[PDB]
Design a protein. Structure first.
Length: 692
């Protein structure tokens, strides 16, 4: 809505749609109604538009993004046309926040008055779009070509006081904006002749091609698979043209960006982050437990990184270890990590000191006695878990949540080591745990709903993207990545080499291909897993290539030698001859005559192995929705943000096509791998996507 009130010959229209006065249909309609009332009232000499509560306006209402209501007249474009046509002067009274369509609205007024401390931005580029209601044409008219380009391409906010000396604001005041804007409006309300419009100003620049030529290169370099930045710059370039020509060019660039798979991807990830908190049978408002202090078992790499997430949020942690010397080691690693970021200018040494001030360390389980949340981060061996969780069950206060960081193991069985399996949950962090955003929350059969809701809340407090998985081997992320690695392996058997595979998938947009990732994790880990599996019920095939690699002792970066060789101080992974010889020989030993594998086949085999397993995950109810799997891949495995996640990418390719490619691969080497997931084949045949 918009409220309307006259006072002293000034109609004041107040945007009122908390939390940020989003420009939804009812708000846009309120602005127009208010304008109509103000223009009819002969006592009204001028008009002030402002916002209620904590914003002028943050722009588009996200709750409407995706309704018919987002496009229902009056649109922001038609709102602005009304403001521009007003015979009475319109003064925007800007405080706190004016972003996107909000800023576009203020720019459509005759005058603008701002208080200091207001966040000013056009962040459309962040969802893969551009400011599509005149911002690219009006902003350079008030702050200059280069400054508008910078704001619009970066999407970054700027405090209102920094616009002093430009034409964005006619007056900047220290305190309350409304009384100064009403007074301003009284003064222009008495003047006679017509009032200014930003569209009448002209962008002035001594050498626009000079500037833009340089800017084009630097933008193209930074933008790396995102089309919006350059299109934003080309829109702002249009502001040199007559207004209506510039505006048409802005609109065209908007409509172009709206079609891009990248804008779809950025939106999918925005909305997917928000939806990850939704659990079908744990409704919003399920009450949670207070988590004030935390404990972590293990001071090694994982325990340490986990701890830091809590310290960074202001939540104290006690780390338990066995030997005092482990503590000293672990704590020094944490302080090293923090001092490294302070060296790189990413926090102060005072902030380092306060975070280390919240860290305690013990050797006794008995000092874990009033922690509200205890996270176990020890050796991945069920018998070690049993020892830890039995101690925790004696020691921990009633109501404490007992969490395992396990990436593999059966959380239902961990829980059965205690008398209170309802308080046992998986909290699977990803390495390095202070950097990776993903938190895979594993819901045990017995895990309470309160406990689940609590871990979700804690996740958001320590700035993780928390996604809920049911219990199965590998949960969501690792279960899928096994199928991806399996295909990688098979490619080597058939004719690929490691660098070739990693480059192809890295070009597709993964941060790190599977062979480099195997080397970083340690190839020995997967080796032991496979050896125990071959003894078990599974008679799955894997390429023996990885086994043969470990039989050479080439564990990866930790031994300087994995699929590739590594030199200290040197980020390049170097191909190794002995490795490549073993691969070529291995194909000989299978009687496989090697073939040339395209980069395209590499990407399809890798990505589509993810997709197929994700669809089985969905069918089982292990993940509650496809976007959850996308967020896992975006936040845990370096899947390209510009493509949205594996499931969204399958949708973008067309599930009909994906199923065809699978059916083709089923005719080849280990075709057992390429039976189409039932859910995927059903969506394909109905013409549907995983995500709608």
């Amino acid at each position: 809505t918009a409220q309307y009130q006259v006072q002293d010959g000034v109609a004041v229209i107040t945007l009122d749609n908390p939390p940020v006065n989003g420009l939804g249909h009812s708000t846009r309609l309120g602005i127009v109604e208010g304008m109509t009332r103000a223009l009819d009232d002969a006592a009204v000499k001028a008009i002030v538009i402002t916002g209620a509560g904590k914003a002028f306006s943050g722009g588009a209402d996200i709750r409407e993004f995706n309704t018919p209501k987002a496009m229902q007249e009056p649109t922001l474009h038609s709102v602005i046309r009304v403001l521009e046509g007003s015979s009475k002067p319109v003064v925007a009274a800007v405080h706190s926040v004016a972003m996107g369509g909000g800023l576009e609205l203020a720019l459509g007024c005759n005058y603008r008055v701002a208080s200091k401390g207001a966040q000013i931005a056009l962040p459309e580029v962040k969802l893969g779009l551009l400011p599509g209601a005149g911002g690219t044409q009006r902003l350079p008219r008030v702050i200059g070509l280069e400054a508008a380009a910078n704001m619009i391409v970066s999407g970054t906010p700027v405090l209102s006081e920094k616009f002093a000396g430009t034409k964005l604001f006619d007056e900047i005041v220290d305190g309350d904006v409304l009384p100064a804007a009403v007074k301003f409006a009284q003064n222009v309300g008495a003047a006679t002749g017509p009032h200014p419009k930003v569209r009448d100003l002209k962008v002035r620049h001594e050498n626009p091609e000079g500037y833009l030529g340089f800017a084009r290169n630097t933008v193209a370099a930074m933008a790396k698979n995102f089309p919006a930045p350059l299109k934003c710059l080309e829109a702002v370039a249009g502001s040199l043209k007559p207004f209506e020509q510039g505006l048409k060019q802005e609109r065209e660039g908007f409509l172009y960006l709206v079609t891009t798979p990248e804008s779809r991807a950025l939106r999918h990830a925005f909305f997917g982050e928000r939806a990850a908190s939704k659990i079908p049978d744990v409704p919003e408002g399920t009450p949670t437990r207070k988590i004030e202090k935390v404990a972590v078992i293990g001071a090694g790499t994982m325990g340490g990184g986990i701890s830091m997430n809590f310290l960074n949020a202001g939540i104290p942690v006690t780390i338990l270890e066995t030997k005092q010397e482990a503590l000293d080691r672990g704590v020094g690693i944490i302080r090293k990590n923090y001092e490294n970021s302070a060296k790189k200018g990413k926090l102060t040494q005072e902030k380092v000191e306060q975070r280390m001030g919240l860290l305690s360390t013990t050797l006794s389980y008995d000092d874990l006695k009033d922690a509200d949340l205890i996270i176990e981060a020890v050796f991945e061996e069920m018998g070690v878990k049993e020892t830890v969780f039995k101690k925790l069950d004696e020691v921990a206060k009633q109501g404490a949540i007992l969490a395992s960081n396990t990436s593999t193991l059966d959380v239902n069985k961990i829980a059965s080591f205690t008398k209170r399996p309802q308080d046992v949950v998986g909290m699977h962090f990803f390495s390095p745990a202070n950097v990776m955003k993903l938190l895979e929350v594993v819901r045990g059969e017995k895990t309470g709903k309160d406990v689940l809701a609590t871990v979700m809340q804690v996740g958001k407090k320590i700035k993780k993207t928390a996604v809920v998985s049911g219990v199965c081997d590998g949960f969501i992320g690792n279960r899928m990545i096994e199928q991806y690695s399996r295909q990688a392996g098979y490619l080597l058997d058939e004719g690929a080499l490691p660098e070739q595979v990693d480059k192809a998938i890295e070009k597709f947009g993964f941060a790190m291909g599977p062979f480099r990732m195997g080397d970083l994790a340690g190839n020995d880990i997967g080796w032991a897993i496979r050896k125990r599996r071959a003894v078990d019920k599974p008679e799955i095939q894997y390429s023996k290539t990885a086994d043969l690699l470990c039989e050479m002792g080439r564990f990866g970066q930790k031994t300087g030698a994995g699929w590739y060789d590594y030199k200290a101080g040197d980020r390049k992974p170097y191909p190794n001859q002995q490795v490549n010889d073993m691969i070529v020989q291995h194909s000989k030993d299978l009687g496989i005559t090697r073939r040339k594998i395209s980069d395209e086949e590499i990407v399809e085999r890798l990505v589509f192995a993810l997709v197929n397993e994700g669809a089985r995950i969905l069918e089982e109810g292990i993940a509650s929705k496809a976007s959850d799997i996308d967020m896992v891949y975006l936040t845990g495995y370096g899947f390209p943000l510009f493509r949205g996640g594996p499931m969204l990418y399958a949708d973008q390719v067309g599930l009909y096509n994906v199923a065809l490619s699978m059916k083709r691969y089923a005719k080849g080497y280990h075709g057992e791998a390429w039976q189409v997931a039932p859910l995927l084949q059903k969506l394909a045949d109905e013409g549907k996507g995983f995500n709608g």
